[PDB]
Each structure stands twice: as structure tokens, then as C-alpha cells.
Amino acid sequence: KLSLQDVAELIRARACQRVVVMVGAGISTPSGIPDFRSPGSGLYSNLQQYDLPYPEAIFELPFFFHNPKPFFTLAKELYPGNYKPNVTHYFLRLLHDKGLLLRLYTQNIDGLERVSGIPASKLVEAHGTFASATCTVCQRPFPGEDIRADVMADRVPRCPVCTGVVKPDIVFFGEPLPQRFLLHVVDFPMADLLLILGTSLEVEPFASLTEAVRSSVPRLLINRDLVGPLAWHPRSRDVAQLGDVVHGVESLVELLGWTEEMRDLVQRETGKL
Numbered sequence: 001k002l003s004l005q006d007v008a009e010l011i012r013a014r015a016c017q018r019v020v021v022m023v024g025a026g027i028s029t030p031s032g033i034p035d036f037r038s039p040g041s042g043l044y045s046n047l048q049q050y051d052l053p054y055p056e057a058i059f060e061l062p063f064f065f066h067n068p069k070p071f072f073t074l075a076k077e078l079y080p081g082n083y084k085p086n087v088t089h090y091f092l093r094l095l096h097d098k099g100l101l102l103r104l105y106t107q108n109i110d111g112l113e114r115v116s117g118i119p120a121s122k123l124v125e126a127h128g129t130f131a132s133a134t135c136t137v138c139q140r141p142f143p144g145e146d147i148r149a150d151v152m153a154d155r156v157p158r159c160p161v162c163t164g165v166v167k168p169d170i171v172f173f174g175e176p177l178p179q180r181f182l183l184h185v186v187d188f189p190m191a192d193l194l195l196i197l198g199t200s201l202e203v204e205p206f207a208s209l210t211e212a213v214r215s216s217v218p219r220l221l222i223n224r225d226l227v228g229p230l231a232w233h234p235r236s237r238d239v240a241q242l243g244d245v246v247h248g249v250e251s252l253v254e255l256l257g258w259t260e261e262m263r264d265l266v267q268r269e270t271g272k273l
């Protein structure tokens, strides 16, 4: 069986160079991103005023059209520039500057990856972005700030053409994933180390994508617990690092060498925040 020390070594030795990364909800825990399933949080109570068939309706269309506000209360809350990224994101970015990040796939819609300084050439925001939008009728792309003005002031924006409701480019149920997800196919075979952090591997196709990388590719899970297929039938080259995702990450960071360089980077980056 492998271990953190082991994986560390392969990254240093330069025998891992082609690192694909899967993040979900847990990387953007330490940054503050409140869950609307968990009570006791601005967002939770705010979304209770609106009566809601069931939590998912927030990301269903037919409902959205019957009443957006629930979705928008959330948009307002996550709109760029109210949540810093944390150390988990800033490693991923360091991973990048070291020439190692093949691609980073995320089920998160906080865009904390971008704001951490990862170029979007490297990201695949599989559940969408807030940085754009689209009249639900008369069809036009709109940049993100174009509507922000309203979003912060609680109003539900319209196209200056349709007057149809402009909707941020969060993927809703019933729709298929961003086109961008077509790398699904090249990235995974091209990967020589898969890195799974802060995800429960529960939503599709992330469950599936973990079994994509080749047979002999190690999967370093860093999570509160062991999940998905890494649990339900693991591979010899899997190595789990259970625990807080940060005391996971900063552990690795040392094993490799970069405790220093990490701090340096977090300095430049939160002097600009």
C-alpha cells in the first residue's frame, strides 16, 4: 500500500507531472462558504423566508421561473468578492506554477479557484460559474458585473432586449454539463496522479471520473473520510489522508518542501485581498 510520503516522492522526483485534481465542497469550507442544508448561517435563514418544495428546487428551472429569488439570494451571497480563498486553493495554484497541474475539475460554484489565481485554461467549473449569465429567452451572453449591480441591491435582472430574466451560468438540473467538460476524455487518460480533495464523490459524473485514470495511477484522497469508489473497491496505488482538508494539505506541503514557498505566495496573494 502507498502513503503520503510515497506520493510526495513521486512529485519531487518529477515522475508525477500531469496532475489532475477533483475538488468539491470541502475545499471551500475554510473560506466560509455556508451550506444552505446546514442551519445557523446568514444564507440558511435567508432561504427559509422563501418556501421551497425541497432544497434542490433552488437549481431547477421550472421553479426558477415560477420564482427566482431563492436562487438569487444565493447568487448574491456567493457573487465574486465576498469570499477569499484559503490555503487549500492556494496550494492548487502553487501546484500550477510548478508546471504540474494538468487540469482542475470542480463541482464548486464559488469561483474561489479563479480568484486564487488559477487561469481558466486550467479550470473546468463543472457546475458552472457566476462570472457570466444568459437571458432565459432572447439568449444573449452577459458578463458577470453587468448584473451584479442589481444582484447586490436584491433586484432580479432583465435583458435590455427581451426584458427576460438573466440567469447566471450555474448549471441547473435537466441540463447537460458545460461543453468544457469534454476534456472528461483527454485529461483523465493523460493523468499520472489524480488528487481528490473535499469531495464526497457523490454527484455525477465525479463518481465515475475517478475510475477513469489508468489502472496504475495513484489516487491521493484528502478528505474528512473515505468515499465513493476509493471506499467501495480501492486500488493498490490509492493513498488516503483523512482529516481536515487543511491539516491534510499543509502536511503534504511539508513532505514535498514547499511550506516556505506556500507562505510566500499566501503573502503576495492576501496583500492583494
Ligand SMILES: NC(=O)c1ccc[n+]([C@@H]2C[C@H](COP(=O)(O)OP(=O)(O)OC[C@H]3O[C@@H](n4cnc5c(N)ncnc54)[C@H](O)[C@@H]3O)[C@@H](O)[C@H]2O)c1
Residues within 6 Å of the ligand: 023, 024, 025, 026, 027, 028, 029, 030, 033, 034, 035, 107, 108, 109, 110, 127, 198, 199, 200, 201, 202, 203, 222, 223, 224, 225, 227, 243, 244, 245, 246
Ligand atoms: N463551495 C461550494 O461551491 C459549494 C458549497 C456547498 C455545496 N456545493 C455543492 C455540493 C456538491 C459539492 O461536492 P460534494 O461532493 O457534493 O460536497 P458535499 O458537501 O456533499 O461533501 C463534502 C465532502 O467533503 C468532506 N469535507 C467537507 N468539508 C471538509 C473539510 N472541511 N475538511 C475535510 N473534509 C471535508 C465531507 O465529508 C464530504 O465527504 C455539489 O453539488 C456542489 O455544487 C458547493
Ligand SMILES: O=C(Nc1ccccc1-c1cn2c(CN3CCNCC3)csc2n1)c1cnc2ccccc2n1
Residues within 6 Å of the ligand: 033, 034, 035, 036, 037, 055, 059, 109, 127, 170, 171, 172, 173, 174, 175, 203, 204
Ligand atoms: O445542497 C447542495 N448541493 C447539492 C447537494 C446534493 C445534490 C445536489 C446538490 C447540488 C446540485 N447542484 C447543481 C445542479 N446539478 C449540476 C450537476 N448535475 C445537474 C444538477 C448546481 S449546484 C448544485 N448543488 C448545496 C449546493 N450548493 C451550494 C452552494 C452554495 C452553498 C450551499 C450549497 N449547498
Ligand SMILES: [Zn+2]
Residues within 6 Å of the ligand: 134, 135, 136, 137, 138, 139, 140, 159, 160, 161, 162, 163, 164
Ligand atoms: Zn436577453
